[PDB]
Amino acid sequence: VLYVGSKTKEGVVHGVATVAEKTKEQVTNVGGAVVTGVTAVAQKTVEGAGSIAAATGFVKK
Amino acid sequence: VLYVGSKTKEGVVHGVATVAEKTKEQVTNVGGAVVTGVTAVAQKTVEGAGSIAAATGFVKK
Amino acid sequence: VLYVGSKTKEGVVHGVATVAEKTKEQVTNVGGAVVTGVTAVAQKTVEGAGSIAAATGFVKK
Amino acid sequence: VLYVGSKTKEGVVHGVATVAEKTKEQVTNVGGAVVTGVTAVAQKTVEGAGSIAAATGFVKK
Amino acid sequence: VLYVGSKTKEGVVHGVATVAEKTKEQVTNVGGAVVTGVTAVAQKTVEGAGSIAAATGFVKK
Amino acid sequence: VLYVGSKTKEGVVHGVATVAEKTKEQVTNVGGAVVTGVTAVAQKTVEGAGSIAAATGFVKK
Amino acid sequence: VLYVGSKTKEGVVHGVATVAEKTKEQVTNVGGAVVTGVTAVAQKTVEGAGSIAAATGFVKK
Amino acid sequence: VLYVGSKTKEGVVHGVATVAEKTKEQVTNVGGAVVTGVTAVAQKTVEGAGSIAAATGFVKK
Numbered sequence: 001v002l003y004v005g006s007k008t009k010e011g012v013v014h015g016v017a018t019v020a021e022k023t024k025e026q027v028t029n030v031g032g033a034v035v036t037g038v039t040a041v042a043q044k045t046v047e048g049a050g051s052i053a054a055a056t057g058f059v060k061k
Numbered sequence: 062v063l064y065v066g067s068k069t070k071e072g073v074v075h076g077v078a079t080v081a082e083k084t085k086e087q088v089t090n091v092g093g094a095v096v097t098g099v100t101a102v103a104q105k106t107v108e109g110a111g112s113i114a115a116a117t118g119f120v121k122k
Numbered sequence: 123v124l125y126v127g128s129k130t131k132e133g134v135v136h137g138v139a140t141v142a143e144k145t146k147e148q149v150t151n152v153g154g155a156v157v158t159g160v161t162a163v164a165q166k167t168v169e170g171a172g173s174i175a176a177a178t179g180f181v182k183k
Numbered sequence: 184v185l186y187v188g189s190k191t192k193e194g195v196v197h198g199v200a201t202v203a204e205k206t207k208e209q210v211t212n213v214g215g216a217v218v219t220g221v222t223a224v225a226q227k228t229v230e231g232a233g234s235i236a237a238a239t240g241f242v243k244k
Numbered sequence: 245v246l247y248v249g250s251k252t253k254e255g256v257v258h259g260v261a262t263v264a265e266k267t268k269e270q271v272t273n274v275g276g277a278v279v280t281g282v283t284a285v286a287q288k289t290v291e292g293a294g295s296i297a298a299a300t301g302f303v304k305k
Numbered sequence: 306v307l308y309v310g311s312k313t314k315e316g317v318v319h320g321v322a323t324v325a326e327k328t329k330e331q332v333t334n335v336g337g338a339v340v341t342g343v344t345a346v347a348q349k350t351v352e353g354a355g356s357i358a359a360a361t362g363f364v365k366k
Numbered sequence: 367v368l369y370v371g372s373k374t375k376e377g378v379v380h381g382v383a384t385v386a387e388k389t390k391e392q393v394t395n396v397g398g399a400v401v402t403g404v405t406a407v408a409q410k411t412v413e414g415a416g417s418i419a420a421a422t423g424f425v426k427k
Numbered sequence: 428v429l430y431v432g433s434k435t436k437e438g439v440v441h442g443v444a445t446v447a448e449k450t451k452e453q454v455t456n457v458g459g460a461v462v463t464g465v466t467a468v469a470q471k472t473v474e475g476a477g478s479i480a481a482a483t484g485f486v487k488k
């Protein structure tokens with residue numbers, strides 16, 4: 001009955017340095033799912049599913 | 062009955078430096094799903110599904 | 123009845139330095155799922171499934 | 184009834200330096216699931232399944 | 245007699261990302277010389293002295 | 306008599322990522338010379354002295 | 367008489383990632399010379415002295 | 428008479444990752460010379476003295 005939060009962190013990203021030097025980056029997709037290059041991502045979910053970088057081929061029900 | 066939040070963080074991104082030097086970046090998609098290049102993203106969901114970089118091939122019900 | 127959080131961390135990423143030098147990066151997908159290059163990702167889920175870099179081939183029910 | 188958290192850490196990644204020099208990185212997927220290159224990832228799940236880098240071939244029910 | 249320069253670089257700085265988070269930065273100088281915080285500086289000198297971040301206490305001739 | 310330069314580099318800095326988190330940075334100088342924090346600096350000198358981060362106490366001739 | 371330079375490098379710095387987390391950084395100088403924190407520095411000198419991070423106490427001639 | 432340089436390197440630094448976590452860094456100088464923290468430095472000198480991190484107490488001629 002006396003919750004006291006103070007300077008708390010939940011789902012936090014900080015202090016990120018990235019260098020990426022590429023000559024050729026190619027993605028070829030035929031009927032599927034491709035996720036590429038996810039950087040410095042943060043989230044908080046309450047009462048639900050939390051997905052960040054999810055690829056599902058297909059759902060053929 | 063006495064929740065006291067103070068300087069709390071939930072789903073936070075800060076301090077991000079990114080350099081990307083590419084000569085050729087190509088994406089070719091035929092009937093699928095492609096997600097590429099997600100940087101410095103933050104969210105908070107209450108009572109729901111929270112997705113950031115999600116690719117689903119297809120839903121053929 | 124007297125929860126007192128103070129400077130706590132849950133699902134936190136900080137202080138990350140990355141260099142990536144490639145000449146050719148290629149992804150070829152035919153009806154599947156490919157996830158590539160997930161860096162500096164943090165999340166917190168309450169009452170749900172938490173996935174970060176998940177690839178599912180397909181769901182043929 | 185008197186939980187007192189102080190400077191605690193749960194699912195935390197910090198102080199990570201990575202260099203990756205490649206001439207050719209290729210992924211070829213035909214109807215499966217491929218996950219590649221997951222770095223500096225942290226999460227905390229309460230009352231749910233927590234997966235980071237999971238690849239499932241397919242679910243044919 | 246046939247100098248042919250092509251895409252040459254001399255005194256060049258490029259692709260620099262910097263983050264600096266400080267709570268207190270102080271400089272106290274009494275009769276001296278202080279240089280602080282020189283970032284991403286480039287020069288080319290022909291037939292002369294080239295100095296970038298030089299501090300000389302004093303010249304009492 | 307047929308100098309042919311092509312894509313040459315002399316005094317070059319590139320691809321630099323820096324993070325600096327400090328609580329207190331102090332410099333106290335009394336009659337001297339202090340140089341601090343020189344990052345990503347490049348120069349080319351022809352027929353002269355080339356100094357980057359030089360501190361001389363004093364010159365009492 | 368047929369110098370042919372091609373993709374040559376002289377005094378070059380590239381691909382540098384640095385993280386520095388300090389609580390207290392102090393410099394106290396009384397009549398001397400202090401150099402601190404020189405990162406990712408490159409130079410080329412022709413027909414002269416080349417110094418990068420040089421500290422001289424004093425020159426009392 | 429037919430010098431042919433090709434993809435040569437002279438005084439080159441590349442691919443450097445550094446993390447430094449300190450609680451207290453102090454320098455106290457009284458009439459001397461202190462050099463501290465030189466990282467990822469490259470130079471090329473022709474017909475001259477090349478010094479990188481040199482500290483001289485004093486020159487009392």
Ligand SMILES: Cc1ccc2c(c1)sc(-c1ccc(N(C)C)cc1)[n+]2C
Pocket residue numbers: 003
């Ligand atoms: C910081 C924080 C976050 C959530 C949170 C609390 C504190 S306390 C609490 C709670 C949940 C269920 C019940 N009952 C049904 C008896 C009573 C309290 N929640 C859900």
Ligand SMILES: Cc1ccc2c(c1)sc(-c1ccc(N(C)C)cc1)[n+]2C
Pocket residue numbers: 064
């Ligand atoms: C900061 C914060 C946010 C939400 C929050 C609390 C604190 S505490 C609380 C709560 C949830 C359910 C119930 N019952 C059904 C007994 C009673 C209280 N919520 C929903």
Ligand SMILES: Cc1ccc2c(c1)sc(-c1ccc(N(C)C)cc1)[n+]2C
Pocket residue numbers: 125
């Ligand atoms: C920081 C924090 C977050 C959540 C949290 C607590 C502390 S304590 C608590 C709780 C859960 C279930 C029940 N009952 C059903 C007896 C009573 C209390 N929750 C849910």
Ligand SMILES: Cc1ccc2c(c1)sc(-c1ccc(N(C)C)cc1)[n+]2C
Pocket residue numbers: 186
């Ligand atoms: C830090 C922290 C996190 C969770 C947490 C506590 C403290 S204390 C607690 C709890 C769980 C169940 C019950 N009952 C049903 C008697 C009472 C308390 N939880 C769930």
Ligand SMILES: Cc1ccc2c(c1)sc(-c1ccc(N(C)C)cc1)[n+]2C
Pocket residue numbers: 247
């Ligand atoms: C790219 C470039 C820049 C300058 C440069 C050359 C090429 S070639 C040259 C030269 C210097 C001195 C003399 N003599 C006194 C015989 C003859 C030529 N300079 C001065």
Ligand SMILES: Cc1ccc2c(c1)sc(-c1ccc(N(C)C)cc1)[n+]2C
Pocket residue numbers: 308
């Ligand atoms: C790329 C480059 C840079 C400088 C440079 C050359 C090529 S070639 C040259 C030279 C210097 C002296 C003389 N004499 C006095 C015979 C003739 C040529 N310099 C000075």
Ligand SMILES: Cc1ccc2c(c1)sc(-c1ccc(N(C)C)cc1)[n+]2C
Pocket residue numbers: 369
């Ligand atoms: C790339 C490069 C840069 C400079 C350079 C050469 C090649 S070749 C050369 C030279 C120096 C001295 C003399 N004489 C006095 C006979 C003749 C040639 N320089 C000065």
Ligand SMILES: Cc1ccc2c(c1)sc(-c1ccc(N(C)C)cc1)[n+]2C
Pocket residue numbers: 430
């Ligand atoms: C790559 C490179 C760099 C320097 C360089 C050469 C090639 S070739 C050369 C040279 C020096 C002296 C003389 N004489 C006085 C006969 C002739 C040539 N240098 C000085």
